[PDB]
Design a protein around this motif. Structure first.
Motif, mmCIF file in Angstrom:
data_model
loop_
_atom_site.group_PDB
_atom_site.id
_atom_site.type_symbol
_atom_site.label_atom_id
_atom_site.label_comp_id
_atom_site.label_asym_id
_atom_site.label_seq_id
_atom_site.Cartn_x
_atom_site.Cartn_y
_atom_site.Cartn_z
ATOM 1 N N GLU B 17 0.820 -1.204 0.000
ATOM 2 C CA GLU B 17 0.000 0.000 0.000
ATOM 3 C C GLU B 17 0.856 1.256 0.000
ATOM 4 N N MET B 18 1.953 1.250 0.749
ATOM 5 C CA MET B 18 2.853 2.393 0.718
ATOM 6 C C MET B 18 3.438 2.578 -0.673
ATOM 7 N N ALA B 19 3.818 1.480 -1.326
ATOM 8 C CA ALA B 19 4.342 1.576 -2.681
ATOM 9 C C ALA B 19 3.310 2.165 -3.628
ATOM 10 N N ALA B 20 2.066 1.708 -3.534
ATOM 11 C CA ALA B 20 1.031 2.240 -4.412
ATOM 12 C C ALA B 20 0.830 3.727 -4.175
ATOM 13 N N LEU B 21 0.752 4.124 -2.908
ATOM 14 C CA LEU B 21 0.535 5.527 -2.580
ATOM 15 C C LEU B 21 1.670 6.394 -3.099
ATOM 16 N N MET B 22 2.911 5.970 -2.867
ATOM 17 C CA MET B 22 4.045 6.773 -3.298
ATOM 18 C C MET B 22 4.132 6.836 -4.812
ATOM 19 N N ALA B 23 3.820 5.740 -5.499
ATOM 20 C CA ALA B 23 3.815 5.785 -6.955
ATOM 21 C C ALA B 23 2.785 6.778 -7.467
ATOM 22 N N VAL B 24 1.579 6.755 -6.900
ATOM 23 C CA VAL B 24 0.552 7.689 -7.346
ATOM 24 C C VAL B 24 0.975 9.122 -7.068
ATOM 25 N N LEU B 25 1.538 9.379 -5.887
ATOM 26 C CA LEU B 25 1.961 10.740 -5.572
ATOM 27 C C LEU B 25 3.065 11.212 -6.507
ATOM 28 N N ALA B 26 4.063 10.368 -6.753
ATOM 29 C CA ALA B 26 5.138 10.758 -7.652
ATOM 30 C C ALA B 26 4.612 11.032 -9.050
ATOM 31 N N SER B 27 3.668 10.220 -9.524
ATOM 32 C CA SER B 27 3.044 10.518 -10.807
ATOM 33 C C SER B 27 2.311 11.850 -10.763
ATOM 34 N N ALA B 28 1.635 12.135 -9.653
ATOM 35 C CA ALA B 28 0.932 13.401 -9.489
ATOM 36 C C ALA B 28 1.876 14.576 -9.298
ATOM 37 N N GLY B 29 3.168 14.324 -9.119
ATOM 38 C CA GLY B 29 4.136 15.392 -8.975
ATOM 39 C C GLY B 29 3.973 16.456 -10.038
ATOM 40 N N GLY B 30 4.450 17.665 -9.763
ATOM 41 C CA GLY B 30 4.171 18.807 -10.604
ATOM 42 C C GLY B 30 5.112 19.007 -11.771
ATOM 43 N N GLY B 31 5.956 18.028 -12.086
ATOM 44 C CA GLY B 31 6.834 18.121 -13.227
ATOM 45 C C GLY B 31 7.929 19.155 -13.047
ATOM 46 N N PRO B 35 10.897 26.024 -13.809
ATOM 47 C CA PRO B 35 12.356 25.892 -13.760
ATOM 48 C C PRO B 35 13.044 27.247 -13.825
ATOM 49 N N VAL B 36 14.362 27.210 -13.595
ATOM 50 C CA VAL B 36 15.194 28.414 -13.607
ATOM 51 C C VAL B 36 15.494 28.919 -15.007
ATOM 52 N N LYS B 37 14.959 28.272 -16.044
ATOM 53 C CA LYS B 37 15.298 28.625 -17.419
ATOM 54 C C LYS B 37 14.854 30.030 -17.802
ATOM 55 N N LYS B 38 14.000 30.666 -17.003
ATOM 56 C CA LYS B 38 13.472 31.982 -17.339
ATOM 57 C C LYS B 38 14.587 32.943 -17.729
ATOM 58 N N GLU B 39 14.387 33.640 -18.845
ATOM 59 C CA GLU B 39 15.356 34.584 -19.374
ATOM 60 C C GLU B 39 14.747 35.975 -19.368
ATOM 61 N N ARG B 40 15.603 36.979 -19.247
ATOM 62 C CA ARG B 40 15.143 38.355 -19.176
ATOM 63 C C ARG B 40 14.919 38.912 -20.573
ATOM 64 N N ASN B 41 13.782 39.573 -20.769
ATOM 65 C CA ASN B 41 13.477 40.204 -22.047
ATOM 66 C C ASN B 41 12.615 41.424 -21.744
ATOM 67 N N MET B 42 13.243 42.594 -21.713
ATOM 68 C CA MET B 42 12.569 43.833 -21.359
ATOM 69 C C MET B 42 11.997 44.556 -22.562
ATOM 70 N N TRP B 43 12.055 43.957 -23.743
ATOM 71 C CA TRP B 43 11.473 44.576 -24.921
ATOM 72 C C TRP B 43 9.993 44.841 -24.713
ATOM 73 N N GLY B 44 9.573 46.062 -25.014
ATOM 74 C CA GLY B 44 8.174 46.416 -24.935
ATOM 75 C C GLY B 44 7.579 46.298 -23.556
ATOM 76 N N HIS B 45 8.364 46.543 -22.515
ATOM 77 C CA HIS B 45 7.846 46.444 -21.168
ATOM 78 C C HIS B 45 6.865 47.581 -20.908
#
Lengths: 70, 70
Positions: B17-31, B35-45
């Motif tokens: 049961e713990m395995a099932a619960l943890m698998a479901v939660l990990a699948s439900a994880g938010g991906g 991420p930190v990939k955001k880049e700055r772009n002040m054009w047309g601010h």
């Protein structure tokens, strides 16, 4: 009575020479006699064409100063 | 170890049961989850579209600061 007058430092002209001299000098005088106030027109002023860094102190001392001088 | 963990406050699951619960939660994880990939772009601010009085304090506290924040 505190204004600058014309002075004939040397010589003692007679009324005729005085009149001739004054007429010639008055004719020589000219330029803006009673000019109107010079019209303000800041359109396309050179200060507006300059690249200013976003944090440039000249944005205060040159741009704002020029636009506000009055 | 100062990580915030998952707690099973009430109940006592069996390993399956713990395995099932943890698998479901990990699948439900938010991906990637912002991420930190955001880049700055002040054009047309938006701040650059605003009219500022030539002596506006917002030229410092809004415009300059927006362009300078990192």
């Amino acid at each position: 009575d505190h204004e600058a007058h014309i002075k004939v430092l040397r010589g003692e002209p007679t009324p005729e020479e005085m009149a001739a001299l004054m007429a010639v000098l008055a004719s020589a005088g000219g330029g803006p006699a009673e000019p109107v106030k010079k019209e303000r027109n800041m359109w396309g002023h050179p200060v507006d064409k300059l690249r200013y860094s976003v944090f440039s102190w000249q944005r205060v001392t040159l741009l704002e100063r020029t636009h506000m001088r009055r």
